[PDB]
Structures are given as structure tokens and as C-alpha cells.
Amino acid sequence: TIIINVRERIEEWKIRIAAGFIREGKLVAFPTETVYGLGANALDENAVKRIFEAKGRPADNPLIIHIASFEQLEVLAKEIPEEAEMLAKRFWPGPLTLVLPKSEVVPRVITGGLDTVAVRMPAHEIALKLIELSERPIAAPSANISGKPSPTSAHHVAEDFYGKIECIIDGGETRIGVESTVIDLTEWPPVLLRPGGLPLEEIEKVIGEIRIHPAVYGKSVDTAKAPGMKYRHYAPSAEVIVVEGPRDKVRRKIEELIAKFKEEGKKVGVIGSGSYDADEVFYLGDTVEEIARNLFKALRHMDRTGVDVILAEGVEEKGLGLAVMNRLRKASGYRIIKVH
Ligand SMILES: C[C@@H](O)[C@H](N)C(=O)O
């Protein structure tokens, strides 16, 4: 593995090293505005397949293709809806992923064997410069072991993958903290498949109101058009209990369980903004924007220690809040103590 520190400023030749790797059919981890992605050349079955391997990822769970130019979209998808052009021209480059019907050049191995392809234009200097220089599209899911928390720093990528992959570009920590929003434009009205860095409300202002796939709220799915729907994800080794309801009643409830779970002789931490006494306590932030930014730091911080159980305070499902609650809820496999 080669780690390229590009935190301070970007230096062309550094990124060129990695571009070579991408071309050589090797794996390269890169920063994005959302999470680090584990990238391969998208036009190379072999390269791509290396990704599912490294991750332990079912060939079933599709990948997202990252582009840097609007013209490469027409290359990867056919019969592009009008809405897609409107969302792309308003929100790309940005934390938005569009599901479209697949052009023929895109390998079935990327899409998990569907005529539907997921595409994004990452809003990050490096992610874009990498794509340009490597003169190829990059298929790139979250750069973690399948099932575990998402990476939001090179440290996180490295503790999962140092040794086992050729390259990690270190860009510092990712600005937003959670994955891109996936919108399905292969149906009318469109469907939100994964809540993300781009709030629903913003998208609904542009194109019409959209529907929400029940996957978002924990319906198991036989077949997945996008990542983060089928299989477990975002989950530490530990157990996670998410508690939601009004401020005090949630805090109160958290306190009962700390003590309850301490009596059973279990080590316990909490994620939230409420100030309890336990082995571990990670403060997520005052604002949702801040919470989204720290969510995986926290989940990984807890996992590295030896807490056997984690208690997460819920948050409002508006804005980035829809994503955090989605992630937490899917981390615990839907253990949600609802308080009234
Ligand atoms: C790697 C990053 O782009 C991730 N796949 C996302 O959609 O947010």
C-alpha cells in the first residue's frame, strides 16, 4: 500500500501516481465530500471485482460510478430522463447519486447484474482530479470492510485496508460525513433509495415531490438498485440501541439502560449530546450538520475500545437528520426504543 498525504495542498504528480494505479486495474482509496471511497477503474471487470473481494461484499450489492464531466454520463446511461439533467445541473458536483438505466459499456459486475447504473459526480478537488488524470470512471463504494462503519478519514480507511490494497490518498476528513443521496430516476415519480448528504427537501424543490423506498425505514429488500439497502451496514461489533422521542425522556431512558447494562457486567458507551456517566461518551454536536460529520468517527471510536453496547440519542428526521437516523437505525438492525 502507498499512502499519499495531500492534506495541505494538492500536488499534481502525487495524484498522478494514483491515476496510474487506477489505470493499472488496481484499487485506490480516495476522499470525497461524503465518505472515503475504495475506487477501481469502472471499465475493467477485473479491477472492479477486486473491490468486492477486498470488502467481503456480495456481488449483489451494486456500486456507484464517479464521473468528473457531464459528458461521461451520456457514456454510462441511456434514455436519460429530463429530471436527471435538472438535478445534475443543479447539484453536481455534489452528494447526489442518480440511478439510471444502464448503457451497454457499463459492466454488469458494477451494477450487481442490472440494467440500472448508479452515478455520481463527487464534489471534491482530489476525487475529481483523480478521475480526470486517470482518464477513466471510478466505481467506488464506501472504503470499509462490508458491514462495518463508513470511513470518513484516511485513518479509518487504513485501519481496515493498509496492506491489502495498493493506494490510499489521504485528504483529511470528509466535509459532510455521510454518503450521497441516491435518487431513483428509473421510475415515475422518483424514489429516494438512500438518504444522504443532499437533503430530500432540496431535491423536492427542484423536480417534483418524490417517494421513499421502504428500505430506508428497514424493510428488507430481495434485490437492491443502490448501496445501503440490502445486507447489514454501518454496524460496529458492539450492540447499538437507538433511543428516540423528546429530549429529557430519551436522556432519562439512556440513564436507566446505562445502569441496567452496567449491572449485567457489560461495558457501555453512548453517542449523543446529553452528558451521562459511562465508560465511553462521544459528543456528536450541537447541530445536525455537525452530528452527521462526527457520526462515523464516533462509531469507530466506540468499536476500537471494548464497549459491548452503544446507546445513541435520536435526532430530528429533517435535513441530514434523515440520513443519520437511517444510518443509526441500520447499524443496530432496527433496535429502536421509542419513548413517549
Ligand atoms: C465514496 C462516496 O462517493 C460514496 N459512494 C457516496 O455515494 O457517498
Q: Is the CB of 179 under 6 A from ligand 1?
A: yes
Report how far apart, in Å, the C-alpha atoms of 66 and of each of 41, 253, 274, 294, 325 are: 10, 43, 38, 24, 26
Annotated ligand binding at 334? The verdict is: no
CATH of 2-217 among 3.30.56.10, 3.40.50.720, 3.40.50.300, 3.90.870.10: 3.90.870.10
| Mode of pairing for the β-strands spanning 309-313 and 167-170 | unpaired
Q: How far is the CA of 304 from the centre of ligand 1 (A)?
A: 24
Note whether 117 and 101 are within 8 A (CB). yes
CB neighbour list of residue 248: distance below 8 Å, 6 or more residues apart: none
Strands (E), 96-195: 96-101, 116-120, 138-139, 167-170, 181-184, 191-194
Ligand 1 atom with the smallest distance to the CA of 141 is: 5
Ligand 1 atom with the smallest distance to the CA of 66 is: 3
Q: Which residues of 302-337 are buried (b: 16+ CB within 10 A; e: fewer)?
A: bbeeebebbbbbbbebebbbbbbbbbbbbbbeeebb
Q: Is the CB of 152 under 6 A from ligand 1?
A: no
Ligand 1 atom with the smallest distance to the CA of 127 is: 3
The 8-class DSSP code of residue 309 comes to E
- Cα(310)–Cα(254) distance, rounded to whole angstroms? 10
Note whether 123 and 95 are within 8 A (CB). yes
Closest to 244 (Cα-Cα) out of 151, 302, 326: 326
Instruction: Extract the C-alpha cell encoding 206.
Output: 427542484
Experimental resolution (Å) = 2.9
- Cα(67)–Cα(231) distance, rounded to whole angstroms? 26
Cα 123 off chain centre by: 14
- Cα(238)–Cα(305) distance, rounded to whole angstroms? 10
SS3 label, residue 38:
strand
CB neighbour list of residue 17: distance below 8 Å, 6 or more residues apart: 2, 4, 167
Residue of 34, 119, 225 to mutate, ligand 1, most atoms within 8 A of C-beta: 34
Annotated ligand binding at 215? The verdict is: no
The three-point CA angle 51-138-224 to 5° equals 60
Annotated ligand binding at 41? The verdict is: no
Q: Is the CB of 195 under 6 A from ligand 1?
A: no
Q: How far is the CA of 66 from the centre of ligand 1 (A)?
A: 8
